Design a protein around this ligand. Structure first.
Ligand code: FAD
Ligand code: FAD
Ligand code: MXX
Ligand code: MXX
Ligand code: ZN
Ligand code: ZN
Lengths: 230, 230
């Protein structure tokens, strides 16, 4: 009574396991009466590159191009490309941002990396002052829902990939905490592709299940100690 | 000596501090007699999105598109888009791959993330099985030359950002080591925007200076302990 949720989704295939997970999040959150909006990056052909096209009108310095400066000023002067400001409006309205993506190289797919690079701009998402605990997005929740190719076992302290929390750091702390998000525990669906079709059926159901009480949840302590420590 | 180097460069502005580090690498390795190639990703308008456009033949499963499966097959059949195979030929021929980039959200800019997602495909850079010390690019070296907005002090274990090595993990270990590269110690040029003009000139010459004896360096132990301590 009531909540707004943005799902930033990065998978090429609607019939994929990621697509199922995005669709059960939409179904469950809509059923609870939440306002839901989805940014389907691939379907939108979302631009991942940080270029001077991201500024309309004229550059606060067309001699030397500096992306961060130009986008900081463009933001303040309402001169950012509309793909960007369409996304920032969705984020500004959201109480929760859920990112749904397969892990690509211990991180997000480039198209979703480009969303963070280009949407979470200085003045919108952070400022002096206003990072970490005081980043401009404080008040909001963010949650990573990741699928992997490697098994839970590979993702331990002394498994081949190291601990899941190791790759989460740049996303949870370096990006989401930096901006002021309180970060909920990641949802990780380990290795769907090596089934079973029913164990999959089941990982979907657990995600839906968890979305039922998502609003009761406590944020993780987003710390060096949480990700690396013991 | 008789060595081939590929620099993968990701900055929009030739007069930038990244541009200067890239040029000094080129000047110094060329002076040594090395064969040098640069992939200047922004200038190439390098495509970062992993889509079905990257395969030109009949898809192995056209009903449900799986980028990893379809590119693995495409690589074996030689039906990958030519921008990808152009980069693969550069990598295949290189003895050392240097990545030169500003840190973006604790990671590489999206356009370079897209290079890693699309160029390092299954069959070319790794196979399952055939990764980490068995990865397919064994015998090659890689090095990250990264510039930051944050100062060295901010990137320490007790600094706001955590230790600099924490954000290297997904790139050094999860991508480069996974593919079989031996990783040389990163070159991190801290906060050049803050540094004085002579400190900048000094950071440029420290890189040029290091490159004088690069072929004598040993790789780092690319393990959790090196990155996280403990
Ligand atoms: C989307 C985004 C995300 C970011 N995320 C992060 C992050 O997670 N962590 C973080 O720490 N930072 C982050 N930053 C900021 C940071 O990485 C960059 O600002 C960058 O590393 C600075 O490098 P540059 O080449 O652009 O510097 P420039 O601004 O080009 O360098 C300062 C310059 O010295 C220059 N110069 C060029 N050549 C020379 C030379 N030969 N001698 C002396 N001076 C020279 C220019 O004259 C200019 O004054 C982010 C920035 C953006 C836009
Ligand atoms: C460039 C790249 C880099 C990568 N890097 C990494 C990495 O660093 N680490 C790592 O661990 N992995 C990595 N991977 C592997 C990748 O993370 C996994 O392939 C991906 O997460 C699988 O998720 P998906 O949605 O694509 O699964 P899918 O293959 O689409 O689905 C698994 C199965 O579930 C089925 N399905 C669809 N809907 C449902 C439903 N409702 N219920 C049950 N089943 C359903 C599908 O049809 C399929 O049979 C990488 C892959 C690529 C292409
Ligand atoms: C390209 O990277 C991968 C592609 C496919 C994978 O499994 C299908 C990968 C991985 C990685 C990095 C780790 C990893 O554990 N797995 C399991
Ligand atoms: C978008 O992230 C940044 C943009 C600009 C920055 O400084 C110029 C940043 C940062 C971060 C994350 C850390 C950080 O320490 N700095 C210093
Ligand atoms: Zn944090
Ligand atoms: Zn390693």
């Amino acid at each position: 009574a009531g909540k707004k949720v943005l799902i930033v989704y990065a998978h090429q295939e609607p019939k994929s396991f990621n697509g199922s997970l995005k669709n059960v999040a939409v179904d469950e959150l809509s059923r609870q009466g939440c306002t839901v909006t989805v940014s389907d990056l691939y379907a939108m052909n979302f631009e991942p590159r940080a270029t001077d096209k991201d500024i309309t009108g004229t550059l606060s310095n067309p001699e030397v191009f500096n992306y961060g400066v130009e986008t900081h000023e463009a933001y303040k002067q309402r001169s950012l490309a509309s793909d960007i400001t369409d996304e920032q409006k969705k984020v500004r309205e959201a109480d929760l941002v859920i990112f749904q993506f397969p892990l690509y190289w211990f991180s997000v797919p480039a198209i979703l990396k480009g969303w963070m690079d280009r949407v979470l701009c200085q003045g919108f998402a952070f400022d002096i002052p206003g990072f970490y605990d005081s980043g401009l997005l404080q008040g909001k929740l963010a949650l990573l829902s990741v699928t992997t190719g490697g098994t839970a076992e590979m993702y331990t302290k002394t498994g081949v990939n190291g601990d899941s929390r190791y790759f989460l750091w740049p996303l949870q702390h370096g990006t989401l905490h930096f901006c002021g998000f309180k970060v909920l525990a990641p949802q990780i669906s380990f290795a769907p592709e090596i089934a079973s079709e029913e164990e999959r059926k089941g990982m979907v159901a657990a995600w839906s299940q968890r979305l039922q009480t998502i609003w009761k949840e406590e944020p993780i302590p987003c710390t060096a100690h949480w990700h690396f420590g013991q």
